[PDB]
């Protein structure tokens, strides 16, 4: 069996978004569809199931109101709608079967993420950092890359052609204020550094931007 | 909506170890056909979540068989074995029995293991964040361990909170170790006004703070 869900969406607060999940290989219509959410801090929440084969529908006390769940079978599909909706609401949403009392939930989709925010897509930003003047020399020393003022995720962080994979830290991206940023740390030889060209490849298959700023003593 | 709260938070366990992860019930969630229907799933990061064990008492189909469950009407716990590096994921547990059904708070877990002190270093701006009209100031804490940081931004004597980042980065594999970028955007008006910038930070295998700075002066 498989549960294929939609693709990723960004949308503006206060609109709405309807997300599918469609099944195959088994009855569709005599399986329970569960909605979970995961935002990304932590936890799975479950929104509510639906029933393709009647109407019947549940939803957990917080999400009432929030979601509404439909379900086409003569397409193996179901359906959530997302309410007026804000910044909280931005979360990796996923689709399972069911059956309650019985084998229970051995299939879920791949998710789909919801991305809430009123920016609109940017490109990629790179400031390649170097060490402080005003810092000792040895042999040991950190490398940075910094990417910032970009939308929407994801943008992927690469040395030239893995020049020099382990040894690098990527942290995950925050907002400033509207726009996302990242940070990845590396650490070379000394003696390598100065002889050796190490860089930092920026892409960003959204903008279809690529980019590639090499870094200098400073 | 059945509260179901699950301990501990984390749970850090060598490899080989037993770990043992307890779940409880805001009510009883027994049923009358002599089932209780509790369910634990594996989500590993960047993927969807797993069924393990369904039913304590049993268990799917496709899992080794160190897990195992037990517990009673309102008291369940999951056990263990050995511990492995696949192994590694959050944890939750699912009550079947009550509608609605929810999920667990969630137990991350982690593998404990030699601890390392912090390596930190500083990487004030570059030649193109001068020009754009800004200062990116970053500080970097690679491969740390545990998680008992707390970085202070101290500068020139007078420690600065607005405008800090906190972002870390999720357990490594071939270290195992966690690494710390904090950034402190900061714009030319303000940036060359102050003299120097100092990245305090503190941890547990050295109780006397760490100290790290330099000046813009020169
Ligand atoms: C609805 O009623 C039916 C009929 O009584 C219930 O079916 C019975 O369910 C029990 C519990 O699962 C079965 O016993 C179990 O059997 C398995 C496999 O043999 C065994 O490993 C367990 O230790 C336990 O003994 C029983 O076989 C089954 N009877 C029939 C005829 O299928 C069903 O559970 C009820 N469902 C609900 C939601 O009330």
């Known amino acids: 069996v498989q549960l294929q869900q939609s693709g990723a969406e960004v949308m503006k607060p206060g609109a709405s978004v309807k997300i599918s999940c469609k099944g195959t290989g088994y009855t569709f219509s005599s399986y329970w569809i569960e909605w979970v959410k995961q935002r990304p801090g932590h936890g799975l929440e479950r929104i509510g199931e639906?029933?393709?084969?009647?109407?019947?529908?549940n939803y957990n006390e917080k999400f009432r109101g929030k979601a509404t769940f439909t379900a086409d079978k003569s397409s193996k599909t179901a359906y959530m709608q997302l309410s007026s909706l804000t910044s909280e609401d931005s979360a990796v949403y996923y689709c399972?079967?069911?059956?309650?009392?019985?084998?229970?939930?051995?299939?879920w989709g791949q998710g789909t993420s919801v991305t809430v925010s009123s920016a609109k897509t940017t490109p990629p930003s790179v400031y390649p950092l170097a060490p402080g003047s005003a810092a000792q020399t040895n042999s040991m020393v950190t490398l940075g890359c910094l990417v910032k003022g970009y939308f929407p995720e994801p943008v992927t962080v690469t040395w030239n052609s893995g020049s020099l994979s382990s040894g690098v830290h990527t942290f995950p991206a925050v907002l400033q204020s509207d726009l996302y940023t990242l940070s990845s740390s590396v650490t070379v030889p000394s003696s390598t550094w100065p002889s050796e060209t190490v860089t930092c490849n920026v892409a960003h298959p959204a903008s279809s931007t690529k980019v590639d700023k090499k870094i200098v003593p400073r | 909506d059945v509260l179901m709260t699950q301990t501990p938070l984390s749970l850090p366990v060598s490899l080989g170890d037993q770990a043992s992860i307890s779940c409880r019930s805001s009510q009883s969630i027994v049923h009358s056909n002599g089932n209780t229907y509790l369910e634990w799933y594996l989500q590993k990061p960047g993927q969807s979540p797993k069924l393990l064990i369904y039913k304590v008492s049993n268990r799917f189909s496709g899992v080794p068989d160190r897990f195992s469950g037990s517990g009673s009407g309102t008291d369940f716990t999951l056990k263990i074995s050995r511990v492995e590096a696949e192994d590694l994921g959050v944890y939750y547990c699912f009550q079947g029995s009550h509608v609605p059904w929810t999920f667990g708070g969630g137990t991350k877990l982690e593998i404990k293991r030699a601890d390392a002190a912090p390596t930190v270093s500083i990487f004030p701006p570059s030649s193109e964040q001068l020009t754009s009209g800004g200062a990116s100031v970053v500080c970097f804490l690679n491969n740390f361990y545990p998680k008992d940081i707390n970085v202070k931004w101290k500068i020139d004597g007078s420690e600065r909170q607005n405008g800090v980042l906190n972002s870390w980065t999720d357990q490594d594999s071939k270290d195992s170790t966690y690494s710390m970028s904090s950034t402190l955007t900061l714009t030319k008006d303000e940036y060359e006004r102050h003299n120097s910038y100092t990245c305090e930070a503190t941890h547990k295998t050295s109780t006397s703070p760490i100290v790290k700075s330099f000046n813009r002066n020169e």
């Open positions: 639906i029933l393709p084969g009647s109407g019947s529908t």
């Open positions: 399972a079967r069911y059956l309650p009392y019985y084998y229970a939930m051995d299939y």
